[PDB]
Design a protein around this nucleic acid. Sequence first.
RNA 1: GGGCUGCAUGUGGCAGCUCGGGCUGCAUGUGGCAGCUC
Lengths: 103, 100
Amino acid sequence: ATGPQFVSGVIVKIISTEPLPGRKQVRDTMAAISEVLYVDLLEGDTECHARFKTPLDALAVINAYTEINKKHCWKMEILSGDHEQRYWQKILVDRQAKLNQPR
Amino acid sequence: ATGPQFVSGVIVKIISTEPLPGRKQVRDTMAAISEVLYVDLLEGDTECHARFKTPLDALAVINAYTEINKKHCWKMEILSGDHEQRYWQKILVDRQAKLN
RNA sequence: GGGCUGCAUGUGGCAGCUCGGGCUGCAUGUGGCAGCUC
């Protein structure tokens, strides 16, 4: 009603060696382990974020090094602190913009 | 495959003192009397042509003194002979041009 | 895709008009039609 609701520990930040694959390819990578609520990815970028339902889901994605990291040559971390807070600020802004689009 | 089929007596030429109204207006004026097929009208011209399905349609239009001649100060005539012939050459040329 | 309208909406858009473009397949002096992307 008011947008995604905050929980801490659900934001995965991915850095890749090659340019990132289609939003569905990235989502389906992690969806193989946990429910992915959202994939925030400029196509062809080498960094993106993925938001998860619960802290344990994001942790389980973080912990699949062979399945994910070594297949896709990715580094993955969970945001915390001010980096987390600023990502949730970006969520807010992105939603506001989409909701105020003219037409 | 080859366009409209020649019928004699189906081409009315319209002459006007002032510029003609839009092609939709000319078409409606005619169609409330007879079955119009085509209205050949260059925007703003003083003359135009209208082609009907049958000779009788065209004659009903020229006989509608009430409904046209007095409401719009138009002179009308049904082409025949060499003028009619040239108007059909004009049809052929227009068609070939739009196809190209 | 532009205009409008409703809806959904960080979740990836939907629909109805309406106007005009790109690819196509028919029609066609008969003033285009149907599709697919905008």
